[PDB]
Symmetry: D2
């Protein structure tokens, strides 16, 4: 033994092309708000008001037009550009100076879910050091990072396994201490040309300082047509009040 | 006794705010395409390739970034700016010179439907003069222009009646001859400050040269959250081929 | 024996890179106005209010943000996209339907000059048919289309000659009848991959219906750093009044 | 007794309207580069590579399109939005967390000058604490912050005096320690509704830790038509090499 927020809103959006030809996936509707508003509200609800937003050079104009300084939402934004869609871990690496010695909650912009994050953030704040991942039991684990759980302990995490050990998806909501940046520096682009967040989670795991919690409500990614539509249906009654209009 | 296309894609998008804070309603997803692609494909399918697009000054950049010259879609686009959301009839008025002496099919950008328009365009091409409107029986006629039909004849059309005479909504797909422009010049902003398309339809009706057809498949507007979501669900399997990606 | 205006504002702007990385050359300052305002004012001063603007897909947003419907300037704009910088003649070809059977004044967006165009437009309006070009004696004719004048008659025009026959540059202000479009259809990309405006001027010349006038005041292109700076210096006291701000 | 860079590129640009209707003053040409490139190169030349850029919400898209992550220029950018043109001091206040305990060089985006800043940064790095301002003798001191110098000591600085005590303009290049932020918190909007940088400079002065240097080459603001044109002429031969294109 001071909590920062990070929303990763980069990527090409190729899977959703052409609805992402001009826009940027995280500015597409999810319910009555642009997708990215959900991540902002999740952090705000936990009193995490210092938030860094990462996106592509081309997309930054539109993202900033929506989010501004953050004053209208009761938060405070800082922006950085990710040159190429080189990976989640690469995007997170740009936030090193912003986080400093504090802890952070990282939310992948296309992850939409019902749980409040506060209970998890509070537990993590009571955790001496390390990281925490949030799990969701899913029907199609092959699409995600998958946690191999034995006797209530994570043995290993595997990214998009052809033969999943379980149905526990490691969601895109990560809680980290500042040590993550020193490890991000020991680079390895995977078979698909990316710095993998699963490698980071396994590093903390091997160090014996990774904890996890199973989420209670619904969760979905919004990066495919079917899952984007699902997120929209699930999000119908979500209301953020007059600050978010 | 030469058919032009017109897509009206203006308006404020206030009903959908904030998902329309930056974008423009007609560039929001409807299925796997931006809403406006549907109108373009409807016209293209009828071999109507000379198309004028009307939108706001602020929105034109994004609309043009999606649509371009029209070459990628096998069509040809021309653009004009509507300064203020002064009405459908006002927007149509900007297309006078573009249409010249030809006939036209006007599609409100937020009208999504399954019918091919060709059968209606072919009938209209065989109509000596006048106009044609396409009707849909709906559950909530109070939201639309409503046709009072007696003995298979339209007696009058009424815009958003408090007490609808019928459930026949006059959809936002209009077929007109070039005489519409001379009448648009005899202006009257309604109680809400707009030049009403219903007034134009009634002018043709009183002249005895308005025809109608009842549509066969589904139809929906996409200007409210619930109706936008409905259009998305209805549009899931719509495929425009590789030209539209 | 009805005069339309055309401003060609396309091209890559590569010569001015990087000041044209984001913007678009014709929106760069020339005096106290964006470059394109000069062309608009020239046409407006001649009571030519129906004006078509041609530019690239990417640049259209910014061009339209400046120009709008044209109402603020007392004119009326219509826009079309030129997919690639395939040439002046190609850009002009997109204006066929807009012009119809009328005559037109074409102004290359980067041509800045002091003369009023009215005297030339009035003469042309009294010309049975054909075209008219406006000439400027220059120090560096090798950069431009060059008119070979003998006994007060144009013998031929040559595009960027290595050995100029004269110092008479054929400026980027062209007056044409509607026959230009039928000829633009008989395509020939030059040695540099473009449809050449000089070929069009020579076609009218061989038909014996091309006239010319020598301009009286200053003129400059604004497509190079040095010439853009020159145009700025020359333009210091140009005032368009409160409509142009 | 670690040097950060700050470029303030906000403001309305009203003085330059309409050439700033769409763009943003700091993206207008100054020589063969956008105005803001000059400030970036000044900092880079001094090995100041961690740079924060402040601008308006609307302008951020274009600024980021030019600057990106900073990788192409050998620097590293972080961006924040200034909601309203509430003043230089207000804009600087947004950089508190970014600077932390380090020192900083602040450059007003519209200040163009020939001197290298290194000699001044090196002296400041050898200064126990405080601030440093750079002075230019000018013909029209009434337009600027003016230093009252007696016996080689600054007695006081006065913002845009009606009756200047001297012709020493306090330029828009400021060198500060991290204490500036604690003072920015003791707010006072001046007679024109702004937090004044001159008040900050006087605070350091009264504390006896403000130093100054007279600049050796040319300097100009670029916020008026005449001064923007002057900056352009002065900047003609400035070359930043292939990284800046
Ligand atoms: C590749 C990349 C992504 N991101 C952002 C954009 C998206 O909102 C978000 C998701 O990136 P994707 O490439 O779709 O990641 P995806 O394949 O869905 O898998 C990730 O997200 C899954 C949960 O959705 C996890 O289970 C996986 O362990 C994790 O690797 O992260 C960036 O900000 N920059 C990037 O370069
Ligand atoms: C007001 C206005 C609208 N339009 C475009 C934008 C929208 O895609 C489309 C619909 O405009 P709205 O104002 O929503 O019209 P709405 O109230 O839905 O009613 C219209 O559309 C209905 C069908 O959707 C018809 O039944 C009504 O007779 C007709 O008046 O027209 C413009 O291009 N410019 C405009 O100023
Ligand atoms: C190539 C091209 C150009 N244009 C527009 C953009 C510029 O404002 C303008 C000039 O194009 P440039 O390619 O620079 O043309 P340039 O080499 O200067 O020469 C032209 O302009 C000269 C006068 O400036 C004439 O003397 C030449 O006969 C004529 O060919 O036309 C387009 O709208 N589309 C295009 O594809
Ligand atoms: C008002 C304001 C300005 N700035 C940026 C935009 C401009 O590039 C730059 C200059 O702001 P201006 O309002 O023009 O400041 P100006 O009246 O020129 O005077 C300042 O700059 C002068 C030097 O140019 C100094 O001598 C004065 O002491 C100083 O107050 O600072 C912002 O980033 N945010 C702002 O709210």
């Amino acid at each position: 033994f001071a909590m920062k927020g990070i929303i990763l809103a980069g990527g090409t959006g190729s899977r959703l092309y052409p609805i992402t030809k001009v826009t940027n996936k995280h500015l597409l509707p999810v319910g009555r708000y642009p997708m990215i508003y959900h991540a902002v509200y999740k952090l705000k609800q936990c009193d995490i008001t210092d938030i860094m937003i990462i996106t592509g050079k081309e997309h930054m104009g539109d993202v900033v037009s929506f989010l501004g300084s953050g004053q209208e939402f009761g938060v405070s934004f800082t922006y950085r550009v990710q040159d190429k869609a080189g990976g989640i871990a690469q995007a997170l690496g740009l936030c090193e100076d912003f986080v400093g010695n504090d802890r952070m909650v990282v939310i992948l912009g296309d992850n939409i879910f019902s749980d409040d994050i506060r209970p998890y953030v509070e537990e993590f704040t009571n955790q001496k050091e390390g990281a925490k991942v949030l799990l969701q039991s899913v029907d199609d684990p092959e699409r995600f990072g998958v946690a191999n759980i034995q006797n209530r302990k994570i043995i290993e995490i595997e990214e998009k396994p052809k033969e999943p050990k379980s149905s526990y998806a490691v969601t895109g909501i990560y809680l980290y201490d500042s040590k993550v940046f020193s490890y991000i520096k020991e680079l390895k682009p995977s078979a698909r040309g990316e710095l993998e967040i699963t490698d980071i989670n396994n590093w903390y795991l091997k160090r014996g300082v990774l904890t996890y919690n199973e989420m209670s409500g619904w969760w979905t990614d919004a990066g495919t047509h079917v899952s984007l539509q699902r997120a929209n249906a699930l999000a119908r009654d979500i209301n953020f009040g007059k600050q978010f209009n």
